[PDB]
Amino acid sequence: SMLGDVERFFSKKALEMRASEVRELLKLVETSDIISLAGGLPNPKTFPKEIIRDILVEIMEKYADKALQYGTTKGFTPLRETLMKWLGKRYGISQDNDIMITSGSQQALDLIGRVFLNPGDIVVVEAPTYLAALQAFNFYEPQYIQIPLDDEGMKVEILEEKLKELKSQGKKVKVVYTVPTFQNPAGVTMNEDRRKYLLELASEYDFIVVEDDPYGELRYSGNPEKKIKALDNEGRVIYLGTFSKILAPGFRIGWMVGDPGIIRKMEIAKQSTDLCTNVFGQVVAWRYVDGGYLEKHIPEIRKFYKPRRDAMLEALEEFMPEGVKWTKPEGGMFIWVTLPDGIDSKKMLERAIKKGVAYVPGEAFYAHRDVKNTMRLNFTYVDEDKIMEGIKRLAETIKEELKA
């Protein structure tokens, strides 16, 4: 830096921003010959490139001025209409809600923090939860309450206990943030009883639920869940979806659905952060949904990832030593492993990398960075042949770690 101590100019918030000793190490691991299970990326093989090509031609023929001009802050009206038709028919989400387009769901999470969170406001998250949601919220200085998951998603039981305990301190929760289907990073899904229980608590204790759902359509087995937002009779849920894993992440288009009063404030907050989400990509996504291509393409995404999930689940079972446990997702992109006898997976990553494999250590997914024996594995973005070999190398890493 040529200004010298450039820190003299930074805000208090900027001074407390870093990231991340491990994400930086992982950035370097990708461009080498380690088998990395660490990534969070969808597989380019699932991008519908031929449909995209046809849509780009159609846009330049019929929609070029709309695609190329500034848009409204709220979003391109035909996309907003086609998404609400889609969510209503596909999920039973109520047309009483309003919808705003976002520059990905990441932007929705930042807007949630800006619109709802004063410093010290309490946000409930799952333990683990999506690391970039914590990153978005952290700028707004909440206090977190962490609710563990099991193989049926958030333990809403423990949420009730913590709400009663906070009540007894004269406090309350403002927002419960959940990624209830095929969680990033856990891979588990909140069952129907718990979704319903979570909404009674939302009514009883008067909080807002944010339901973040990037992965619902990436279902490989089992039957579709009910969206929490489909059960939302009080208008208490803000539902977030994204085109990132069902089209391609490169357009940076997502949507936020919820109470019109909430959406209106979100639109005003968004105006100042980026004016509008890129309209060219909104017009692409509109044709994609309205033209029936999304509906036709989803089965092709599922056919692609299913065997990758299966290969990884087969390899873990065949190779992992006693006492290692993992989730068994019915969908999405991740499998979450729990190690025995107090192994620290952040410490173990050095050894795993030496043996040719990488994963994300679980610690960074916990608001209180308090659990150290967990790992997130990704099965979408490495060749299948490499899934088996990677899981074997991870298994042998764990065996060595368990000794002396």
User: Which residues in the 88-117 window bind a copy of itself by CB under 8 A?
Assistant: 96, 103-104, 106-107, 110, 114-117
105 is annotated as contributing to ligand binding: yes
Q: Is 268 in the site for a copy of itself (CB under 8 A)?
A: yes
Q: Is 380 in the site for ligand PLP (CB under 6 A)?
A: no
Q: Is 188 in the site for ligand PLP (CB under 6 A)?
A: no
Pick from 32, 44, 300, 399 the residue near a copy of itself by CB under 8 A: 44
> Which of the listed partners (ligand PLP, a copy of itself, none) does 242 bind, with a CB threshold of 5 to 8 Å by partner kind?
ligand PLP
* Burial zone of 13 (CB within 10 Å; 0-12 exposed, 13-18 middle, 19+ buried): exposed
Pick from 73, 97, 105, 282 the residue near ligand PLP by CB under 6 A: 105
Residue 242 beta carbon to ligand PLP: minimum distance, rounded to whole angstroms: 3
> Which of the listed partners (ligand PLP, a copy of itself, none) does 296 bind, with a CB threshold of 5 to 8 Å by partner kind?
none
Query: Which amino acid, one-letter code, is at 135?
Result: Q
Pick from 19, 60, 64, 275 the residue near ligand PLP by CB under 6 A: 275
Number of residues engaging a copy of itself in binding (CB under 8 A)? 77
Pick from 47, 86, 205, 304 the residue near a copy of itself by CB under 8 A: 47
Site for ligand PLP in 110-169 (CB under 6 A): 130
381 is annotated as contributing to ligand binding: no
Pick from 106, 277, 278, 373 the residue near ligand PLP by CB under 6 A: 106
CB-based contact 50:248 (threshold 8 Å): no
> Which of the listed partners (a copy of itself, ligand PLP, none) does 115 bind, with a CB threshold of 5 to 8 Å by partner kind?
a copy of itself
Pick from 184, 278, 378, 380 the residue near ligand PLP by CB under 6 A: 184
Site string for ligand PLP, 196-215 (x = CB under 6 A): ----------------x-x-
Positions at the binding site for pyridoxal 5'-phosphate: 70, 105-106, 130, 184, 215, 242, 244, 252
Residues in contact with ligand PLP by CB under 6 A are 104-106, 130, 179, 184, 212, 214, 242, 244, 249, 254, 275
Positions at the binding site: 70, 105-106, 130, 184, 215-217, 227, 242, 244, 252, 369
